[PDB]
């Protein structure tokens, strides 16, 4: 059924599962036409498909050419997402195929269920958690590869860098969601926290900075404060 706080450790068991977030698939800028009307211009997007146990991220880049001449693009974007996730599953060896796919938005359920009819044993589930995966495009290197794409492309990342050498998957996912929640709440301040230090660096093969364990505690606490400080800001507290 639905994934929530109560069955949260299930994310880190040994049954392969993927989260699928479609927020960033169809991305537009709304603007005015010469005649004083409103139009949209699309920009490249991405499907965010993440194994929460291993940190493996299948970033399918959605190039704006896929929208050319199509109508009802918000609706199509859900079915395109479902088509591409199904293609990903079919591309994986059987022992790598997920047993469950958890969509972050319930409107993905029927499109993904329909595209996965050939996979009756793969459970398609919603979640009651508010996950901050929309902020994936705040990670500089993911945003870079998406905007530079000139054609459809899949790029593989480990969104946990090397953290699983030192922390558990549960803790890595908690660090990830905190970071992304901070970037979603106040992108500018979150990035200031991550990068203001001229002594700290991101490895060429990593997404996040190379923090010692103690520095991560400092960073994590600064992210918590940011989320609390922003809460007071927007809700007057």
């Amino acid at each position: 059924g639905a994934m929530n706080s109560s069955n949260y450790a299930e994310l880190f068991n040994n049954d392969i599962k993927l989260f699928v977030d479609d927020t960033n698939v169809y991305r537009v800028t709304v603007h005015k036409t010469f005649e004083g009307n409103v139009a949209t211009k699309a920009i490249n997007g991405c499907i965010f498909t993440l194994n929460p146990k291993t940190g493996h991220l299948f970033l399918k880049i959605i190039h704006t050419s896929v929208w050319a001449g199509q109508k009802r693009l918000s609706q199509l974007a859900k079915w395109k997402t479902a088509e591409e996730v199904s293609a990903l599953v079919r591309s994986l060896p059987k022992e790598e195929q997920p047993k469950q796919i958890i969509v972050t938005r319930k409107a993905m359920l029927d499109p993904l269920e329909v595209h996965m009819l050939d996979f009756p044993n793969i459970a398609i589930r919603p979640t009651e958690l508010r996950l901050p995966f929309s902020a994936a495009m705040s990670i500089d290197k993911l945003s870079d590869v998406v905007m530079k794409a000139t054609e459809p492309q899949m790029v593989l990342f480990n969104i946990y860098d090397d953290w699983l050498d030192r922390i558990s998957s549960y803790t890595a996912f908690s660090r990830l969601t905190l970071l992304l929640r901070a970037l979603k709440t106040n992108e500018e301040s979150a990035k200031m926290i991550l990068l203001s230090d001229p002594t700290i660096t991101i490895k060429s093969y990593h997404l996040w900075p190379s923090f010692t364990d103690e520095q991560w505690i400092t960073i994590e606490s600064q992210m918590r404060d940011l989320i609390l400080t922003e809460y007071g800001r927007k809700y007057n507290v």
Partner: protein
């Protein structure tokens, strides 16, 4: 006009024949129903007074035999029987008519209600849905499950309606996933009409039989099937124009025959508010939209 003689009425029961019903008291001198219009299927239905639980009955065609009702006190239900002695039967009927022990099928001459509810319903098709081939009539009751219900338990007692599942490989062409899910024309026209039902008459027959089973008995599997067959049409962008006009007439007489007290429980909100107001055919059911709104304005 044909006759169905009763050997007696030993237990208090409400007896129906098509849209008519009447109460018979325990051991009242009831010996059956006369003046039954030839040319249509009929259904003779029962609900015992001492246990309204379990409505049951028999679909039959007087053109296919001489049928009588004998109460069975072991199985506790009014059973339909075929009578060999062709003139045993005629002599059985003539005796009770002469003693005026039968009720007359009370058909008003203006009234096409029964024809309109059974236009496409034929005994031959009923008997493929209800599988008991040693009798010429078909038993149905409140509790019988359908084949699709049995997939989601006794198969011989099943209603073998055609399975309809909108999230199924039968319904969805590889590579037309969004197209086929959002527009069910492929599934309606190619899979169901051309492939399975052969024509719309057989489709409407099953649709009408499903409605009558759900309405007359309280058969939940039957209501499910009726809803599904309506939804499959309304959710198809491409439907022959003769089918849309006929569907409108079919449903008009159903929702209208349907006593108001059964509407609260029998009618499914998502299936109907979609068909009338959101579907491709939302504008193609004028008569049917005119009967529900007239008698159900609270709904919308």
């Amino acid at each position: 006009m044909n006759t169905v003689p009763f050997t007696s009425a030993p237990i208090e029961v409400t007896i129906g024949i098509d849209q008519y019903s009447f109460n018979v008291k325990e051991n009242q001198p009831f010996h059956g129903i006369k003046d039954i219009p030839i040319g249509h299927v009929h259904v003779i239905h029962f609900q015992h007074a001492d246990n309204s639980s379990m409505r049951y009955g028999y679909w039959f065609d007087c053109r296919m035999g001489n049928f009588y009702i004998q109460y069975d006190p072991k199985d506790g239900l009014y059973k339909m029987m075929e009578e060999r002695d062709g003139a045993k039967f005629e002599n059985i009927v003539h005796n009770f008519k002469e003693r005026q022990m039968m009720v007359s099928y009370p058909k008003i001459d203006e009234d096409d209600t029964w024809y309109n509810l059974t236009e496409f319903v034929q005994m031959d098709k009923i008997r493929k849905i209800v599988r008991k081939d040693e009798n010429q009539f078909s038993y149905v009751d409140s509790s019988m499950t359908t084949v699709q219900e049995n997939e989601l338990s006794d198969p011989a007692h099943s209603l073998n309606y055609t399975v309809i599942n909108f999230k199924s490989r039968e319904a969805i062409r590889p590579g037309h996933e969004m197209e086929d899910f959002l527009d069910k024309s492929y599934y309606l026209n190619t899979v169901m009409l051309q492939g399975i039902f052969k024509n719309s008459s057989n489709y409407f027959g099953e649709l009408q039989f499903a409605f009558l089973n759900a309405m007359f008995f309280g058969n939940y599997g039957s209501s499910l099937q009726w809803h599904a067959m309506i939804e499959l049409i309304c959710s198809s962008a491409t439907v022959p124009k003769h089918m849309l006009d006929k569907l409108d007439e079919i449903l008009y007489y159903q929702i209208k025959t349907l006593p108001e007290q059964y509407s609260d429980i029998l009618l499914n909100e998502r299936v109907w508010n979609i068909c009338l107001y959101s579907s491709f055919q939302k504008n193609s059911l004028h008569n049917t939209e005119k009967i529900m709104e007239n008698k159900y304005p609270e709904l919308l």
